[PDB]
Paper text:
Integrin-linked kinase ([name]) is one of the few evolutionarily conserved proteins found in FAs to critically control the FA assembly and integrin–actin connection. Our results reveal that by recruiting FA adaptors PINCH and Parvin into a heterotrimeric complex (IPP), [name] is able to trigger F-actin filament bundling via two WASP-Homology-2 actin-binding motifs, one from PINCH and the other from Parvin.
On the other hand, another major puzzle still remains unresolved, i.e., what is the role of Mg-ATP bound to the [name] pseudoactive site? To circumvent this problem, we carefully analyzed the ATP-binding residues in the pseudokinase domain of [name] structure and designed [name] mutation that does not affect the structural integrity but sterically occludes ATP binding to [name]. Consistently, CD denaturation studies revealed that there was little change in the thermal melting temperature of the mutant [name] ([name]) complex (Tm = 53.9 °C) versus that of the wild-type complex (Tm = 54.2 °C), demonstrating that the [name] substitution has little effect on the stability of [name]/Parvin complex. The mutation clearly abolished the ATP binding as well as Mg2+ binding to [name]. We note here that Mg2+, while interacting with D339 at the pseudoactive site, is predominantly chelated to ATP 13,14 explaining why the loss of ATP binding also led to the loss of Mg2+ binding. Next, we examined the ability of IPP [name] mutant in affecting the F-actin bundle formation. Strikingly, as compared with WT IPP, loss of Mg-ATP in IPP [name] led to dramatically impaired F-actin bundling with notable decrease in size of the formed F-actin bundles. Consequently, the mutation further reduced cell spreading and migration. Another major finding of this study was that the IPP WH2-mediated F-actin bundling is highly sensitized to Mg-ATP bound to the pseudoactive site of [name].
Residue numbers in the entry:
A (entry chain A): 183 to 452
B (entry chain B): 249 to 372
The structure:
């Protein structure tokens, strides 16, 4: 084999951070690094799925862009007890954590704009890849915030071929067409721009989108009943314009990330 | 317990039917869907799919199942998908075959619904 991956025996598990439908996250140490260990949850593991994990992981190892957070390595299973991903520990956690679960100063609107620019840069980069990294969904849980407050798109949050294919757990950020059509039948780049518009919404409101609804309700109402985020009042014209065009009903009228980067760069403090 | 109750305990069975109608509507009514009878409204698998997303906190993308099944085969596929979702959440493989639900076998339908109720009865 070309790579054997990380040796599971070398990982020191320190503290449990989280658990959900996808697996468990633990803070740890490995070869002098502070890491997060993601132990994936899978039913009916097989040789085929193991082979797939090992072929899918190397695409996640992106070390050339400051706004992309790579997978540092992965533990192949067998011989690890379960398929596992390792990433460097990002001290502020996810964008979601920072915006919605902060315990201290509230991040200011300058910092929010810098988050938006960072995310757009990272997405513009990921959109240059051929083919696109499959099953990558942008949302506030899948962006991490590093020590100097840089936002980085999290490659460990990409779903694998064997994970939960018909279960969507963050539909509020998903484009209406993507709630209804197979990925093969949608323009994935345009769908990703909707997700970015919802993240702009979240940065403006500092609220969780559709926080009062369950995930099923959200997807059904967005897909079939025209439910949309309400454009917030009292915002600048160019923020309003940008959110509206990024969230256009027609996927083909939404901009490319590399066409919004220069708008966001003007909006920054310098 | 379940088979004794179904075949021999008629009043206990009506309380089970009523509790189950209340339980499924508590969730389905969030989507403006209403169940009035257990005998046929789960047979096409659609509500079972929708219910599983309501109980376990996900949406099911509309291309993953048949929202308006136009054949026996499509219904069977829906119900089989719903049973996978139940297993993904930690239930054992259900006892009825998916075909038993599509063919409106009451005992099969109520056993599936009763195992959901037992596990998920405290979900808001």
């Amino acid at each position: 084999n070309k790579h054997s991956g990380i040796d599971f025996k070398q990982l020191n598990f320190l503290t449990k951070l989280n658990e959900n439908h996808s697996g468990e996250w633990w803070k740890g140490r490995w070869q002098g690094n502070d890491i997060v260990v993601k132990v994936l949850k899978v039913r009916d593991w097989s040789t085929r799925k193991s082979r797939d994990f090992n072929e899918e992981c190397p695409r996640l190892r992106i070390f050339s862009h400051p706004n992309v957070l790579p997978v540092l390595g992965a533990c192949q299973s067998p011989p690890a007890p379960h398929p596992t991903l390792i990433t460097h520990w990002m001290p502020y956690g996810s964008l979601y954590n920072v915006l919605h679960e902060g315990t201290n100063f509230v991040v200011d609107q300058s910092q929010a704009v810098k988050f938006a620019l960072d995310m757009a840069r990272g997405m513009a980069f990921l959109h240059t890849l051929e083919p696109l990294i499959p099953r990558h969904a942008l949302n506030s849980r899948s962006v991490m915030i590093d020590e100097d407050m840089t936002a980085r798109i999290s490659m460990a949050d990409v779903k694998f071929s064997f994970q939960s294919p018909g279960r969507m757990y963050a539909p509020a950020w998903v484009a209406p067409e993507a709630l209804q059509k197979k990925p093969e039948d949608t323009n994935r780049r345009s769908a990703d721009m909707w997700s970015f518009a919802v993240l702009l919404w979240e940065l403006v409101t500092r609220e969780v989108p559709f926080a009062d609804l369950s995930n099923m309700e959200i997807g059904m109402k967005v897909a079939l009943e025209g439910l949309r985020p309400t454009i917030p009042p009292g915002i600048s014209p160019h923020v309003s314009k940008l959110m509206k065009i990024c969230m256009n009903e027609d996927p083909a009228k939404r901009p490319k990330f590399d066409m919004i980067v220069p708008i966001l760069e003007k909006m920054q403090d310098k | 317990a379940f088979d004794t109750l179904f075949d021999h305990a008629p009043d206990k069975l009506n309380v089970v039917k009523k509790t189950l109608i209340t339980f499924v509507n508590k969730h389905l009514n969030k989507l403006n869907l209403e169940v009035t009878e257990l005998e046929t409204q789960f047979a096409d698998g659609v509500y079972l799919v929708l219910l599983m997303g309501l109980l376990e906190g996900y949406f099911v993308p509309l291309h993953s199942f048949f929202l308006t099944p136009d054949s026996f085969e499509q219904k069977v596929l829906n119900v089989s998908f719903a049973f996978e979702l139940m297993q993904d959440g930690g239930l054992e493989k259900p006892k009825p075959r998916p075909e038993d639900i599509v063919n409106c076998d009451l005992k099969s339908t109520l056993r599936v619904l009763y195992n959901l109720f037992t596990k998920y009865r405290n979900v808001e």
